[PDB]
Structure formats: C-alpha cells, structure tokens
mmCIF file of C-alpha atoms in Angstrom:
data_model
loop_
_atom_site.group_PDB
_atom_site.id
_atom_site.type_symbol
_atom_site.label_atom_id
_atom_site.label_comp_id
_atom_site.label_asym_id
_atom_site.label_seq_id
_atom_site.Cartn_x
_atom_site.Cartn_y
_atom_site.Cartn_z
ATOM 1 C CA UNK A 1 37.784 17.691 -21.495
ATOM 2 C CA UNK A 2 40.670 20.122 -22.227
ATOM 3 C CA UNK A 3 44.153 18.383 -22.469
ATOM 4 C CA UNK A 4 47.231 20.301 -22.670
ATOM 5 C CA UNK A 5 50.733 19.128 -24.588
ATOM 6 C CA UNK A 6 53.546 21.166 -23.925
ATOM 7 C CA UNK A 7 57.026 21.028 -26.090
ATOM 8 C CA UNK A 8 59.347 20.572 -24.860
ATOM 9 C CA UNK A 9 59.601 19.035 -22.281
ATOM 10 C CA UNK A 10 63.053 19.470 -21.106
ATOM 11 C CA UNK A 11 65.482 22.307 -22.754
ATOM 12 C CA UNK A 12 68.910 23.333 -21.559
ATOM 13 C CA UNK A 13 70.018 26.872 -22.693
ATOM 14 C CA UNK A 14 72.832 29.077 -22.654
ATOM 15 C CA UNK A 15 72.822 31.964 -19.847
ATOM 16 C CA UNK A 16 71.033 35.340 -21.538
ATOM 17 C CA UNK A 17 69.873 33.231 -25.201
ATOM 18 C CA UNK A 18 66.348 32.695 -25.519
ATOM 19 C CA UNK A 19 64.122 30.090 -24.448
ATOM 20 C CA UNK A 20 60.500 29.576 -26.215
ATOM 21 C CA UNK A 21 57.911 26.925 -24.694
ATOM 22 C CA UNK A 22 54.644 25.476 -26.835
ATOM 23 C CA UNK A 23 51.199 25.059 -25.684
ATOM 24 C CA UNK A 24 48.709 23.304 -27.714
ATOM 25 C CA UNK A 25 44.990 22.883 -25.659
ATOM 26 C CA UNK A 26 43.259 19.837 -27.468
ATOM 27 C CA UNK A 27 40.433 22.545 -27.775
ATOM 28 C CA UNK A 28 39.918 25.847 -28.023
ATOM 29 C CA UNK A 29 40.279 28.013 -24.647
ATOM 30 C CA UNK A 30 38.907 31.105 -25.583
ATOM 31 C CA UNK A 31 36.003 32.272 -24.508
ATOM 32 C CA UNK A 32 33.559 34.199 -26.716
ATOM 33 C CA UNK A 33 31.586 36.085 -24.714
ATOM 34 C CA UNK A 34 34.766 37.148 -24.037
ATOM 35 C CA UNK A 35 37.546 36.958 -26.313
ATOM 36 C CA UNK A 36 39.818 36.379 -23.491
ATOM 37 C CA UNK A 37 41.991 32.542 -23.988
ATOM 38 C CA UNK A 38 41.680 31.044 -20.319
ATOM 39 C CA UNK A 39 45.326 30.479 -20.137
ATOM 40 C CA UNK A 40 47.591 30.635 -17.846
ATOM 41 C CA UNK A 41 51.611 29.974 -17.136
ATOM 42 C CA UNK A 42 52.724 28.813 -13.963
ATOM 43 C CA UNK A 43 56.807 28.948 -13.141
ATOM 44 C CA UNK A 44 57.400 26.042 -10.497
ATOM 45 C CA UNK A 45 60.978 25.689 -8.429
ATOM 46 C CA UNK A 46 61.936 22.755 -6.518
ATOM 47 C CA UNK A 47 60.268 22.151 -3.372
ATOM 48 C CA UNK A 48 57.735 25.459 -3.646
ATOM 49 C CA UNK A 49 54.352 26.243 -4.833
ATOM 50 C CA UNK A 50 53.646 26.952 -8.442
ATOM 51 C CA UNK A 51 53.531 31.316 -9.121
ATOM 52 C CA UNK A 52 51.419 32.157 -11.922
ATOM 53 C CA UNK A 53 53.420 34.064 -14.443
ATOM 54 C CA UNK A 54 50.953 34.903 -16.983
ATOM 55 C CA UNK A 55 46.414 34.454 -17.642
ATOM 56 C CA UNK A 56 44.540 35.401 -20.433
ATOM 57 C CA UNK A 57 47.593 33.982 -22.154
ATOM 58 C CA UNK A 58 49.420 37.387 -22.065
ATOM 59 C CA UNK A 59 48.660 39.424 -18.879
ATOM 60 C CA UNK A 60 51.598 39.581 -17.375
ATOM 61 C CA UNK A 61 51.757 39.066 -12.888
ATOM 62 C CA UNK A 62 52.457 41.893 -11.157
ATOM 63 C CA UNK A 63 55.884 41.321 -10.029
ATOM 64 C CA UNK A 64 56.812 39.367 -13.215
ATOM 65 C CA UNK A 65 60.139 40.398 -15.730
ATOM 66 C CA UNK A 66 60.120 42.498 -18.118
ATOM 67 C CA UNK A 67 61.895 39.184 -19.955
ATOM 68 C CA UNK A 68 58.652 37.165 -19.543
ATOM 69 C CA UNK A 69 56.079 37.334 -22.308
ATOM 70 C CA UNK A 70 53.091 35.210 -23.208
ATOM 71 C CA UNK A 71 51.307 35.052 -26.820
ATOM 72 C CA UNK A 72 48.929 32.348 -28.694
ATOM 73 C CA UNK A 73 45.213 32.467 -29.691
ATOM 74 C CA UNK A 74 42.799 29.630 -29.871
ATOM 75 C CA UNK A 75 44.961 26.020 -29.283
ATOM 76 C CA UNK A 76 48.166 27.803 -29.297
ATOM 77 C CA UNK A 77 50.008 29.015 -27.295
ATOM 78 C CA UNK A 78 54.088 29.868 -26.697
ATOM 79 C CA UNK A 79 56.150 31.557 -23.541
ATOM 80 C CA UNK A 80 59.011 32.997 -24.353
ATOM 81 C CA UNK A 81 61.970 34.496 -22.131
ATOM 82 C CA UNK A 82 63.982 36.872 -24.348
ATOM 83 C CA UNK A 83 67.107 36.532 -21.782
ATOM 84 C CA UNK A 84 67.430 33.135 -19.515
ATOM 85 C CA UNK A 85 69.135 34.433 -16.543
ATOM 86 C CA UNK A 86 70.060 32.222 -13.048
ATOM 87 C CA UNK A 87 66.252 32.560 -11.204
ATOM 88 C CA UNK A 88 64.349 32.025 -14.670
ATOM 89 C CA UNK A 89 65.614 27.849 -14.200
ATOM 90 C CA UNK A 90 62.919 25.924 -13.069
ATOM 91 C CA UNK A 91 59.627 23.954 -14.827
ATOM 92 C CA UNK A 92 56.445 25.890 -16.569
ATOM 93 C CA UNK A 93 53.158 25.160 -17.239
ATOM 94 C CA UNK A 94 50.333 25.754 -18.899
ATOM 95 C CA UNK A 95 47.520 25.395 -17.389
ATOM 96 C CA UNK A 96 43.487 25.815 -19.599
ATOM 97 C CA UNK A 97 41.113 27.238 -16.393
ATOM 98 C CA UNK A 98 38.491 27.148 -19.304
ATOM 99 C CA UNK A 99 36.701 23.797 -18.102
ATOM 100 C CA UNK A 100 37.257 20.703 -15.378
ATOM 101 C CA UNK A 101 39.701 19.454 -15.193
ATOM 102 C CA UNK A 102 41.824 22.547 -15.413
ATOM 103 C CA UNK A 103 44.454 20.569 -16.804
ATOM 104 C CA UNK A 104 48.602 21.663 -16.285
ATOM 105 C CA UNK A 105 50.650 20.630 -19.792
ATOM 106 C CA UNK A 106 53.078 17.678 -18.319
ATOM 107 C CA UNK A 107 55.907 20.818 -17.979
ATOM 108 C CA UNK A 108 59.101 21.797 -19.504
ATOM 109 C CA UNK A 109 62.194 21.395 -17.469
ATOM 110 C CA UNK A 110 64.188 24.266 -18.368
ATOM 111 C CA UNK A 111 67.912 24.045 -17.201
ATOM 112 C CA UNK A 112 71.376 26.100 -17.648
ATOM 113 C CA UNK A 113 73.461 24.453 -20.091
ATOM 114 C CA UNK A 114 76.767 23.783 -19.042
ATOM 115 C CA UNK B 1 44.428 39.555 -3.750
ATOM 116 C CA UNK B 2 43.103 36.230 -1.989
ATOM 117 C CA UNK B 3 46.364 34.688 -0.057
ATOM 118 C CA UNK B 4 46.222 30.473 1.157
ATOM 119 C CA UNK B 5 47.888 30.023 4.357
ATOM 120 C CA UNK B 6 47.411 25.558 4.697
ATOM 121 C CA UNK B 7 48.264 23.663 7.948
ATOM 122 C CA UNK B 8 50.245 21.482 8.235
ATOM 123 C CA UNK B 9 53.225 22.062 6.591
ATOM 124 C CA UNK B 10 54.161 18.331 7.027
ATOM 125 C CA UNK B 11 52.355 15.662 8.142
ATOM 126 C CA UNK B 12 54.033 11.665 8.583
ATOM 127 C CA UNK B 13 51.111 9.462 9.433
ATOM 128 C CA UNK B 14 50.564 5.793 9.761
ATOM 129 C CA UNK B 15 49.505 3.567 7.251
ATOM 130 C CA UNK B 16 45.723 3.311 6.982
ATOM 131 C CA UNK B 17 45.385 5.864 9.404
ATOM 132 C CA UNK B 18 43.616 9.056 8.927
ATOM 133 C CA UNK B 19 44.756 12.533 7.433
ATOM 134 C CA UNK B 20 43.461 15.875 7.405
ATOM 135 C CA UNK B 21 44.510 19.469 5.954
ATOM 136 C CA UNK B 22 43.181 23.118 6.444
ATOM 137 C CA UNK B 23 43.136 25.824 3.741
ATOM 138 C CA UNK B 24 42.364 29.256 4.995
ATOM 139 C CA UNK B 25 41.498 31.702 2.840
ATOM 140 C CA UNK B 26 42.207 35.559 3.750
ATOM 141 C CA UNK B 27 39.221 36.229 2.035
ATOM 142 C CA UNK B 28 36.233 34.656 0.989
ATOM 143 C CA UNK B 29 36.075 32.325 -1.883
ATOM 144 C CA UNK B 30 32.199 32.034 -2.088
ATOM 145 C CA UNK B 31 31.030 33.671 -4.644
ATOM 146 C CA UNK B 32 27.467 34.816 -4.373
ATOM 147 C CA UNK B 33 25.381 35.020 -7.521
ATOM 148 C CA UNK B 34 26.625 31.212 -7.259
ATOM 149 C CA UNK B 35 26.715 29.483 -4.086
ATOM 150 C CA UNK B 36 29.725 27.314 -5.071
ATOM 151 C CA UNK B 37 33.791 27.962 -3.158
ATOM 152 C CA UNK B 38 36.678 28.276 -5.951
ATOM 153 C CA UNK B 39 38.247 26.286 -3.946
ATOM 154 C CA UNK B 40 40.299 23.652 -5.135
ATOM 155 C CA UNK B 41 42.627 21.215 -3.875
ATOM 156 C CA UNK B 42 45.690 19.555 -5.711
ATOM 157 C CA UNK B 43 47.756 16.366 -5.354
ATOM 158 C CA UNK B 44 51.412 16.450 -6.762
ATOM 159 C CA UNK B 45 53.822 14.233 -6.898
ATOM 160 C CA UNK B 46 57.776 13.747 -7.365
ATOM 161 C CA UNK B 47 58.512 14.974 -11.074
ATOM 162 C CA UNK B 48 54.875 15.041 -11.949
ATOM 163 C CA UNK B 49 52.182 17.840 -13.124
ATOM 164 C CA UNK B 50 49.372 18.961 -9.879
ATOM 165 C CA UNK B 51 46.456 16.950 -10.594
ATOM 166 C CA UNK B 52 42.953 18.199 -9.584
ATOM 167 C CA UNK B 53 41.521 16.157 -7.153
ATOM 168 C CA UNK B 54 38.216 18.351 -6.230
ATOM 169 C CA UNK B 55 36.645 21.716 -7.363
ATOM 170 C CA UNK B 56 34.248 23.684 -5.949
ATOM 171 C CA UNK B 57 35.493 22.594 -2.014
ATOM 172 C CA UNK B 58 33.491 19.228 -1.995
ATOM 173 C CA UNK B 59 33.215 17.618 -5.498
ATOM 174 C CA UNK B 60 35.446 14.739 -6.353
ATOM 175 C CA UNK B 61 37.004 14.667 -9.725
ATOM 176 C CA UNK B 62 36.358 11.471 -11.681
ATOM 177 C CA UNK B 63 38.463 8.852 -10.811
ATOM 178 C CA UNK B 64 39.650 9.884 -7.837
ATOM 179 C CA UNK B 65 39.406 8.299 -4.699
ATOM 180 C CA UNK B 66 36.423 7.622 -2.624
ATOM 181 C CA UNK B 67 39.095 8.095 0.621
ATOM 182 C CA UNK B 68 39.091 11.899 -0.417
ATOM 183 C CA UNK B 69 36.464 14.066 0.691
ATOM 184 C CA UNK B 70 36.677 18.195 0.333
ATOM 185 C CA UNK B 71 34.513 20.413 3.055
ATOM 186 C CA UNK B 72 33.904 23.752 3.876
ATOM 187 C CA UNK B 73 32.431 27.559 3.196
ATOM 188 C CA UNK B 74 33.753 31.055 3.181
ATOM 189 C CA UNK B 75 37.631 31.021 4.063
ATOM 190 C CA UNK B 76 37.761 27.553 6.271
ATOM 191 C CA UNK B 77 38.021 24.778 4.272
ATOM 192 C CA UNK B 78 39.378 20.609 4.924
ATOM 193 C CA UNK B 79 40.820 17.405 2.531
ATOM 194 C CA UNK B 80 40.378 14.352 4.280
ATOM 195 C CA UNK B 81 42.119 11.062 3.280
ATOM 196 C CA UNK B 82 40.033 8.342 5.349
ATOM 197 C CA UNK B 83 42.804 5.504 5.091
ATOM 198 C CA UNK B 84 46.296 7.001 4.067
ATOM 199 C CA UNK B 85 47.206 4.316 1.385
ATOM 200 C CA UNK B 86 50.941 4.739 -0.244
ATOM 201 C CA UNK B 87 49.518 6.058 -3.394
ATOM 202 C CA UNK B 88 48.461 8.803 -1.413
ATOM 203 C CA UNK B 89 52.114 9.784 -0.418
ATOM 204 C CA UNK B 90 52.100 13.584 -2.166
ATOM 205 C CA UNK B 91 51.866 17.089 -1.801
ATOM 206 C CA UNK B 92 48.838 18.728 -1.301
ATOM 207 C CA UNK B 93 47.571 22.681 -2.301
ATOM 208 C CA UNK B 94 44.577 24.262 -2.002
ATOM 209 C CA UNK B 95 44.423 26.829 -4.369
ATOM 210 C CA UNK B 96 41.802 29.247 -4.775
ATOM 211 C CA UNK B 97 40.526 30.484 -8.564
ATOM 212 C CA UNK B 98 38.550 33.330 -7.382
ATOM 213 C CA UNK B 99 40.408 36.128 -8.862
ATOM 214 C CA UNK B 100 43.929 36.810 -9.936
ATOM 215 C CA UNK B 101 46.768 35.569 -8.822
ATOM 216 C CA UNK B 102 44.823 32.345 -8.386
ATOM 217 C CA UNK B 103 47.377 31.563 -5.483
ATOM 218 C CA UNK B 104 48.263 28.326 -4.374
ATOM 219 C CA UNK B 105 48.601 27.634 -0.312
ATOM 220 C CA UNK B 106 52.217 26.183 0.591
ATOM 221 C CA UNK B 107 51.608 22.639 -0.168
ATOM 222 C CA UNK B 108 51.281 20.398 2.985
ATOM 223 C CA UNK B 109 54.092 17.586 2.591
ATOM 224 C CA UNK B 110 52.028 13.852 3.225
ATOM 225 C CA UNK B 111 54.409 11.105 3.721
ATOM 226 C CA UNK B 112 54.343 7.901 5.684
ATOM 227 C CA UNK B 113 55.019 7.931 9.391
ATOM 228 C CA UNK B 114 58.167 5.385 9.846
#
C-alpha cells in the first residue's frame, strides 16, 4: 500500500518569506496510462473540513492563490507558497488517491513566527 | 461539482449505544460502467491525519472495526457505529472522489453524551 512521509512536520515562518513542504509516496503515484501523479494537497484549518488545494500534483483549485504551487514527479513531491500571508496558516497534506488506502502524509503544521 | 451536505453536525451519545450519520450527495456518486459509490467515509481525530475507514460506501478497510458498517446508493448514503466505544470519539466526513474537488461533507462531531 502507498504510504506518504511529509517534511516537515511543523515550520514557523516569517509573514511574506517562503514556505516549501516535501512529499515522498513509498511508491510511485503516477499513472501510466496516464502520466498524470495521483496527488493531491489538502489545506486543513482548525475545526473545518480539509479544501483540496492542488491534484495531479500541480492543477491548481479553482479559487486557489496565485501564491500556491504544486510540483514533483514519481515519489516526490513539494508545495510551495512563494509569500506566507495571515489565511495561508494552517496544516497540509498530501494525500496518494492512486490505491487503498488513499493515505494523507501525517501533515505539516505551518505557523507565523513570532 | 459534487457538494456533501452530512447530518448531524454533532452528535453526544451514550456509551455503548448506537450512532448513525447521513451523507447526501447533490449528485450521484455511482458511477456506471462500475457499479461501485466513490463514496468514502473518514474518521479524524484531535491533532491526527483522516484515516479511511471504508471505500466504495460499504467496504471496511482492514483493521477497522467490525462496529462500522457503510450503506447506501446514488446520493443517500449511512456510517453506523453499533456500540459507540471511546475509541470511537472523532470526527467523521464523507467525502466523495468522483470528480474534482473531491469535497469533503462538514464533518459530524461524535463525542460522548455526559
């Protein structure tokens, strides 16, 4: 089965510098028939649902900043956010939809340095 | 886009008694040249990743609980927990991985009735 490790897995960061979370699957996640990586980046605040950010590892939500990008072939995977601002603070995932489980990463905690 | 409206928001129930949840889909989740519901429900807990719990409305992931039991077709779908036991104490989503976003319902709030 697909297992997910995420680094790291709590960052603090000043306002507007860049932030940068790894994905590694355990196996590959793209699919050859394909060539799309069945990944996906979920964005999860305190005491709501998880959003989906990103799938296919780079398609971008409607809805989604500019500031939000997703890149990574194979095993893996990176999100960055070229600007942290006050609404970007909360925990990601990655999540493989490739095979059951669809496994979430254990999450990065990403916080406002102060 | 498929939206997940669950019920309840909150449940408090007694020990050992049982709990159920709806998921309704706004559109269907069968799909058709397969038979099977991308329907999926998640249990989360405080500080933790969502762990699947079933797929496919009904199947049980390994390892998981005998007490929990998926039904349903089309847009209308159930999680039972026969007995709430206090490892049970969670969140809840349905979540529906029929086609982008793959939305999550609200999360129904389980805790014990005191």
């Amino acid at each position: 089965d697909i297992v997910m490790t995420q680094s790291p897995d709590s960052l603090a960061v000043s306002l507007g510098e860049r932030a940068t979370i790894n994905c590694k699957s355990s196996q590959s996640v793209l699919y050859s028939s394909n060539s799309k990586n069945y990944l996906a980046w979920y964005q999860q605040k305190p005491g709501q649902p998880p959003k989906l950010l990103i799938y296919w590892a780079s398609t971008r939500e409607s809805g989604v900043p500019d500031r939000f990008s997703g890149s990574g072939s194979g095993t893996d995977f990176t999100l960055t956010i070229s600007s942290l601002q006050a609404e970007d603070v909360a925990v990601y995932y990655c999540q493989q939809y490739y095979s059951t489980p669809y496994s979430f990463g254990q999450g990065t905690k990403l916080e406002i340095k102060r």
